[PDB]
Structure 1
Amino acid sequence: GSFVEMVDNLRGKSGQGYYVEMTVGSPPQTLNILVDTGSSNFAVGAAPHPFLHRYYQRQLSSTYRDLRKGVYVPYTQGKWEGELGTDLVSIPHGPNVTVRANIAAITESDKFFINGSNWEGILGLAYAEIARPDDSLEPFFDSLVKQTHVPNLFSLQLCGAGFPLNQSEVLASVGGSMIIGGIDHSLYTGSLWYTPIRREWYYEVIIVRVEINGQDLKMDCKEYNYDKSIVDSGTTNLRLPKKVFEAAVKSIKAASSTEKFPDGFWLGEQLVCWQAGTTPWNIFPVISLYLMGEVTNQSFRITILPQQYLRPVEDVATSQDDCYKFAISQSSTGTVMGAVIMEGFYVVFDRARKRIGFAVSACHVHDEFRTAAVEGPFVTLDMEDCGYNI
């Protein structure tokens, strides 16, 4: 481990988000910020909200600069709206630098903040193409790299506990690491395997084959990337395109057929519970996603366990049972490799070399019989055909 100052700098969980401490303004105002590889704005609560116990107070910062421009970000779930500006930003458990960055001061929101998440803003780590209102609003990471000697790369180790964490425990537990400017070898085992970043907007990748317990899902690979496949720390679930979801659920049901689960479970709505310590991990299949390699006609695979795709939840009766929700769901906007998938791996966002690396996480949850894996190479032909084009 060469980045001790940044190791263990994350807190949170897959259901509510993983966050890092940051400071904004002069004198510095401390805020907890969601690490989000699926968006490109640094947007912070800047007005009272029922779920915020603190927020950015621009009038108290001598370095605040008003850009005199509004920003409106509606989405299916809800929305956020605010005022654009710039200020001095630092990451206490990060590189020892202070940068001048764009900040969207959130003045109004609907279903954006989460009750008990302990974060007050989001750090959109993706590219300018998807920044709001447009690509002229330089994202935080672009500012950081341009203004300092920090290498153009970051890596994330998100650590799922493997069991529920109550309010007190989730505040006291280490949720993972965000290594800014490098790769820390203590965070993974085995080798790192890289997949190309297809295009710089979201962290877009190409899935070339899918297996459930080694059984090929056997769909046209374009289906797996319809209309895109992305790596998103800001999404809880593994989200799959409608047809892929239907095929994967049928195969997962068939593999786990010795136990019948209600439809509500497969829809990610209802929990399933087992007597303490008796979760039948072995009946559930492993899932392998093959990703395009850096070498022509070569792929590698990442394999996840049900310990990743079954999200631990506290029982309705706070009983002694071990309960979970199915953390694979359908999408109409392509595949999303969310937090539950990222929890199995140390993920390297190598922006400098336009590639994403995967290695087995030193903190992935497993059992005595199976582990997550990152393996290769595999001979795979016509992988460019797996990518979707509008």
Structure 2
Amino acid sequence: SFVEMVDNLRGKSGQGYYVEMTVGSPPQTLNILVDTGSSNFAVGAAPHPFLHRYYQRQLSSTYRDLRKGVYVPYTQGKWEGELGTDLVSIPHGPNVTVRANIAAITESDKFFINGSNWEGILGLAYAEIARPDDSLEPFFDSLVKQTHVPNLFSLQLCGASVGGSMIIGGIDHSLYTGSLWYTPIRREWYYEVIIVRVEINGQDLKMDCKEYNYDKSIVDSGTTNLRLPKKVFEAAVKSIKAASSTEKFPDGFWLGEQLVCWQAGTTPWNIFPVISLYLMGEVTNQSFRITILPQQYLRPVEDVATSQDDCYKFAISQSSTGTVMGAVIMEGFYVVFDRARKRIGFAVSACHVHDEFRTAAVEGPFVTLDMEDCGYN
């Protein structure tokens, strides 16, 4: 019965993907951002200049106050509010209703986005990183406990405004081609994985593989960019510069600030390299790779000028909290969060990115010795 959930995600480029939900009795309809990088379910519950609507606890006969406060600080943005429970449904999801924890947002800073069309957030990661602590049961844990929905979901994020699918409870085989390749979830907090090798246009960056996972690597649909530890980021930017030195860009382009433009239809894709991330596999000494095209890490942005060119922002940036495989990496793959078997699956998406001579791919098997050493402690 998964066809009912195909295409249930919408979004604006650089502003996240959201699904429609209802909370309360009688149902109140809200758009909720889907975030595999956190674990709290929270919604606007007070007026805000950027909110079109919000949760009104006073109007719900099933609302229960938990009489405890809550705040969540993300990398970018933060909010505080009040904890409670209520009944929740997903119209274009399974046909069930769950009593879930809800953080009613009363104040926020740089969290809601002007004109975004979503009003809350659905954190799909594990209780270990929930606020105020791991005793606040996350929504997906409540769903699995209270219904017969299987303990897995899958995300098909389609690039550029944008759309996609969240398949809740299973895998829809019409959304990908080829084989699924699985990597272990290293620890159930973030969706943490282990990167064992990095190549750019087929050349090994030849770093200690611990650098790739210093201090962690996560799969995070709530972050736009590919974010890399300082040492890795500097190595990657240096290589992407050399491959594209045919042209020249402001150095503020490489920092993600200034955009670059070319005359419509003449973007020189062939001078930007492909990036291959190798992930730990399911059997001894085995890995697989996913390959990212420049059409994924050069994010298109509307030209703020009168000329209608093609303009892009560089969507790889530096991190001090580990690798973040963001939406720019997830787009063009079908990603299976197989919580029951503690693994994450990748396959070429049906809505894949089109280059002229190159193809995004998921390929294996590869042999990689000492993969266990690549994890940071």
SS at structure 2 position matched to 1:143: helix
CA pair 96-174 structure 1, distance change in 2 beyond 3 A: farther
* Cα shift readout 1:327-358 (whole Å, capped 9, x = no counterpart): 00000000000000000211000000000000
**What TM-score, normalized by structure 2, do the two folds share?**
0.98
> Does the 8 Å contact 1:14/1:339 carry over to 2?
no
The residue aligned with 1:17 is 16
Q: CA deviation at 1:75?
A: 4.3
Q: By how many angstroms is 1:77 displaced?
A: 3.3
Name 1:300's counterpart in structure 2.
Answer: 288
Quickly say closer, same or farther: Cα 1:99–1:301, change in 2 above 3 A. same
8 Å contact 1:66–1:86 — kept in the other structure?
yes
| Residues 58-115 of structure 1 deviation map (CA, whole Å, 9 limit, x = unaligned) | 0000000000000022345332000000000000000110000000000000001011
Deviation of the 1:319 alpha carbon: 2.6
Structure 1 residues 237 and 103, CA gap change in structure 2 (3 angstroms)? same
- Rate the CA distance shift 1:89–1:278 in 2: closer, same or farther, 3 A: same
In the TM superposition, residue 259 of structure 1 has moved relative to its aligned partner by: 1.2
How many Å apart are 1:117 and its aligned residue? 1.2
SS at match of 2:252: helix
2:53 is matched with: 54
Aligned 8 A contact 2:20 2:91 in 1? yes
| Alignment partners' CA distance in 1, 2:260 and 2:90 | 39
User: What CA deviation, in whole Å up to 9, does each residue of 1:99-137 have, x standing for no partner?
Assistant: 000000000000010112110000000000000000000
Between 1:68-77 and 1:271-280, the stretch displaced more is 68-77
User: 1:233, 1:74 → 2: CA distance?
Assistant: 17
Cα root mean square deviation, aligned = 1.0
Whole-Å Cα distance in 2 between the matches of residues 284 and 63 of structure 1? 54
State which drifts further: 359-368 or 246-255.
359-368
Residues 271 and 326 in structure 1, CA contact (< 8 A), matched pair in contact too: yes
Give the distance between the partners of 1:343 and 1:68, measured in 2 at CA: 40
Q: Can you list the C-alpha shifts for 1:32-54, whole angstroms capped at 9, x where unaligned?
A: 00000000000100000000010
> Do the aligned partners of residues 347 and 230 (structure 1) sit closer, same or farther apart at CA in structure 2, a change above 3 Å counting?
same
Q: Describe how 1:242-257 pairs up with structure 2 within 5 A.
A: 242-257=230-245
Cα contact 1:240–1:335 (8 A) shared by 2: yes
Deviation at residue 362 of structure 1 after TM alignment: 1.1
Which deviates further from its counterpart, 74-83 or 31-40?
Answer: 74-83
Structure 2 gaps of 5+ residues are none
Give me the whole-angstrom Cα distance separating, in 2, the residues matched to 1:341 and 1:32. 23
* Structure 1 residues 13 and 53: alpha-carbon distance in aligned structure 2, compared to 1, 3 A threshold: closer
Tell me if structure 2 keeps the 8 A contact 1:13–1:159.
Answer: no
Quote how far apart the aligned CAs of 1:368 are. Answer: 2.4
Are the counterparts in 2 of residues 80 and 112 from structure 1 also a CA contact under 8 Å? yes
SS of residue paired to 1:266: coil
Contact 1:10/1:18 (<8 A) preserved: yes
Aligned to 1:344: 332
* Alignment partners' CA distance in 2, 1:302 and 1:330: 21
Matched residues in 2 for 1:76 and 1:30: separation? 28
Asked if the contact 2:31/2:119 (under 8 Å) is kept, the reply is yes
- Pair 1:133 & 2:132 matched: yes
The corresponding residue for 2:116 is 117
Secondary structure in 2 aligned to 1:318?
coil
Provide the secondary structure at the position in 1 that maps to 2:231: helix
How far did 1:14 drift?
Answer: 4.2
Shift of 1:11: 0.3
TM-score normalised per structure 1: 0.95
Give the secondary structure class of the aligned counterpart of 2:137: coil
> CA 1:34 to 1:75, structure 2 compared with 1: closer, same or farther past 3 Å?
closer
SS where residue 112 of structure 2 aligns? coil
Report deviation, 1:365.
2.0
Percent of paired sites with the same residue: 100
Cα deviation, residue 367, structure 1: 1.8
Unpaired stretches in structure 1, ≥5 consecutive residues: 162-172
Q: Distance in 2 between matches of 1:318 and 1:145?
A: 51
CA contact (8 A) 1:9 1:174 kept: no
1:236 aligns with 2:224: yes
Q: Secondary structure at the match of 1:356?
A: strand
Q: Matched residue of 2:86: which SS?
A: strand
- Structure 2 CA distance, aligned partners of 1:29 and 1:283? 50
Partner of 1:4: 3
Asked if residue 92 in structure 1 is aligned to residue 91 in structure 2, the reply is: yes
1:297 & 1:285 partners in 2: Cα distance?
27
CA separation of 1:182/1:121 partners in 2, compared to 1, >3 Å: closer, same or farther? same
Which digits, 9 at most, give the CA deviation of each residue in 1:267-309, with x for residues without a partner?
0111111111111111100000000001110000000100110
Residues matched between the structures, number = 377
Q: CA deviation at 1:174?
A: 5.6
- The structural deviation recorded for 1:189 is 1.1
Partner Cα separation in structure 2 for residue 318 and residue 38 of structure 1: 37
Cα offset for 1:257? Answer: 1.7
Looking at structure 2, the residues matched to 14 and 386 of structure 1 have their Cα atoms a distance apart, in angstroms, of: 33
2:317 and 2:289 map into 1 onto residues whose CA distance is: 21
SS of 1:363's partner is: coil
What secondary structure, in the 3-state scheme, does the structure 1 residue paired with 2:4 have? coil
Question: CA deviation digits over 1:225-251, x for unaligned, max 9?
Answer: 000000000000000000000000001
Aligned counterparts of 2:74 and 2:296: Cα–Cα separation in 1: 27
Note if contact 1:242-1:330 (Cα within 8 Å) is conserved in structure 2: yes
Separation in 2 of the partners of 1:67 and 1:20? 26
Decide which of 318, 340, 352 is 1:364's aligned counterpart: 352
Quick one: distance in 2 between partners of 1:186 and 1:301?
22
CA distance in structure 2 between the aligned counterparts of 1:382 and 1:367, rounded to whole angstroms: 34
The 3 A distance-change label for structure 1 pair 300 and 13 is: farther
For 1:73 and 1:152, locate their aligned partners in 2 and report how far apart those are by CA, in whole Å.
Answer: 25
Report what 1:64 is aligned to: 63
Question: Is the alpha carbon distance of 1:362 and 1:75 closer, same or farther for their aligned partners in structure 2, counting shifts above 3 Å?
Answer: closer
User: Is contact 2:6-2:167 (8 Å) kept?
Assistant: yes
